[PDB]
Amino acid sequence: LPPEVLAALERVKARLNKVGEELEPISLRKAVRHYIETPGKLLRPLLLLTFTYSIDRRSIMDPRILEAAAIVELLHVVSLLQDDVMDQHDQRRGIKTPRAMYGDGRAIVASDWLIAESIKMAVNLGADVVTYLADVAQRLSVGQALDLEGERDKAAEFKTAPLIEAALVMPLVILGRRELIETAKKLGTKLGILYQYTKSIANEIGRYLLKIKEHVGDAIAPFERLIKYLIGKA
Amino acid sequence: MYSLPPEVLAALERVKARLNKVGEELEPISLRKAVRHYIETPGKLLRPLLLLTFTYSIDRRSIMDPRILEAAAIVELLHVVSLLQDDVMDQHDQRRGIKTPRAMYGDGRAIVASDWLIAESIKMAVNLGADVVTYLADVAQRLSVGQALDLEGERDKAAEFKTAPLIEAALVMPLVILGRRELIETAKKLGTKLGILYQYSRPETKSIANEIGRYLLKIKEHVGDAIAPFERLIKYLIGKALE
Ligand SMILES: C/C=C(\C)CC/C=C(\C)CC/C=C(\C)CCC=C(C)C
Numbered sequence A: 001l002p003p004e005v006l007a008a009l010e011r012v013k014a015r016l017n018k019v020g021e022e023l024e025p026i027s028l029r030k031a032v033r034h035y036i037e038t039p040g041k042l043l044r045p046l047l048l049l050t051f052t053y054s055i056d057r058r059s060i061m062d063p064r065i066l067e068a069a070a071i072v073e074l075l076h077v078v079s080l081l082q083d084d085v086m087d088q089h090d091q092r093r094g095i096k097t098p099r100a101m102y103g104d105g106r107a108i109v110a111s112d113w114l115i116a117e118s119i120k121m122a123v124n125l126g127a128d129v130v131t132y133l134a135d136v137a138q139r140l141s142v143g144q145a146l147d148l149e150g151e152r153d154k155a156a157e158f159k160t161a162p163l164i165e166a167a168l169v170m171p172l173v174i175l176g177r178r179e180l181i182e183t184a185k186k187l188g189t190k191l192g193i194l195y196q197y198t199k200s201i202a203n204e205i206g207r208y209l210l211k212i213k214e215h216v217g218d219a220i221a222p223f224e225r226l227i228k229y230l231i232g233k234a
Numbered sequence B: 001m002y003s004l005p006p007e008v009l010a011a012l013e014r015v016k017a018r019l020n021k022v023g024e025e026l027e028p029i030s031l032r033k034a035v036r037h038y039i040e041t042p043g044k045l046l047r048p049l050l051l052l053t054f055t056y057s058i059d060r061r062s063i064m065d066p067r068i069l070e071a072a073a074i075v076e077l078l079h080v081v082s083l084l085q086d087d088v089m090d091q092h093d094q095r096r097g098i099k100t101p102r103a104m105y106g107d108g109r110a111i112v113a114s115d116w117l118i119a120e121s122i123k124m125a126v127n128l129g130a131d132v133v134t135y136l137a138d139v140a141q142r143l144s145v146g147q148a149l150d151l152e153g154e155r156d157k158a159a160e161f162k163t164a165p166l167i168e169a170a171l172v173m174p175l176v177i178l179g180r181r182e183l184i185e186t187a188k189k190l191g192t193k194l195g196i197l198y199q200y201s202r203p204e205t206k207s208i209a210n211e212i213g214r215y216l217l218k219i220k221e222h223v224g225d226a227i228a229p230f231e232r233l234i235k236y237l238i239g240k241a242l243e
Helices: A003-016 A025-039 A043-055 A057-061 A062-087 A098-102 A104-123 A129-148 A152-159 A161-175 A179-197 A202-231 B006-018 B028-042 B046-058 B059-065 B066-090 B103-107 B107-126 B128-152 B154-164 B164-178 B181-198 B202-241
Strands: none
Touching: A003 A043, A003 A057, A003 A062, A003 A179, A003 A202, A025 A062, A025 A104, A025 B128, A043 A057, A043 A062, A043 B046, A043 B059, A057 A062, A062 A104, A062 A129, A062 A161, A062 B107, A098 A104, A098 B164, A104 A129, A104 A179, A104 B066, A104 B107, A129 A152, A129 A161, A129 B028, A129 B107, A152 A161, A152 A179, A152 B164, A179 A202, B006 B028, B006 B046, B006 B059, B006 B066, B028 B066, B028 B103, B028 B107, B046 B059, B046 B066, B046 B164, B046 B181, B059 B066, B066 B103, B066 B107, B066 B128, B066 B164, B103 B107, B107 B128, B128 B154, B128 B164, B154 B164, B154 B181, B164 B181, B181 B202
């Protein structure tokens, strides 16, 4: 990716590394930080920073944009911790989970602590951002309930897609480019459904990328590559 | 029982009505049932009662303010979130002769329901301003730390973080909303002690009731006899704790 995005991503990583740094008791801090400290892909923050750079290169190092990327990664951590408890997971890709190592109680309380932290950070981004994240959370909750209730098809859109779309929507709300929201939402949702795993899914994504390109033009390159590259995997 | 103003009881009915709207048409059904369980089998509505009674004593006209009614409902929702999660952590299959949501649907739904409620409360708090939102998130983190200390076998340090933070928010929210910051410090002390005392439902217990009396006295010096219904309520809660 572009050097500027990589640099942004480093600030985000440094910001995430401070979360819970002095949290007490220690059992809570470890449960909170496990998924911050274990090596991850940082898909969501990356999608957000690259989408920003593509739409407004100037705003890449904007403090609100960096904080938003951190927020979306913290909400992803909350989802991991909760899924571990829902599904009683002992491992997540070869690595023992917080619930396995520290109990379900600590895992739950750490997700609560992180939701509050996410909210504290979101407040600075304004009321529209806070309300939107809360709507996102209610969609994820509904999806989990739908899955527990035996409706994998109805739960597909609400299962993990909301965070991916939030990665694309937050920068739009923050920067004021509301005209791209409806498409960014649509794309994020398709990207999300694809992620859980099918030919025309990477086709629509192609179209929505098209519409977006008709708005920002070629400045969309970096983001198109990432999507396309992410597209190739599937 | 309750010797409180009919205006406070009336406000409480409107809070009950607002709470009855929460998650009304929510799907799926198991989510709706888990979410509304502790709202339909209602408790003593102590947290909303404290907020409303305190508001009435500081500013009587504000008991009809939509923001105050919303704040009362939010404090009850967070209490409901705490019940749902506590059911799961302590494995309660019944909570006062009634099957708990975790027992009926499994731990997953209780947790998810709590998640939906946290989100719903944030949505409601946004309408009350950034300070309310920030404050509630700080309350949430304290509750978290409190519960962690518990699980950690640290009842000592857990005393003030486990439930007190919500009792405190019942008194501090209305002050923030009405911009009466001068009383916040005392409201926090008072609320924290009331919460510590109310945790159980002896030597120290009276030392605590004495401290509360002094915080009440400080509020009285500030608002005069208008504080009387709140004072009766605190003395009543103190009473049962000492019974
Ligand atoms: C027994 C008590 C426990 C387990 C703590 C429950 C945690 C609660 C009730 C707080 C949930 C609220 C948040 C995580 C964020 C709330 C912030 C706003 C509504 C602005």
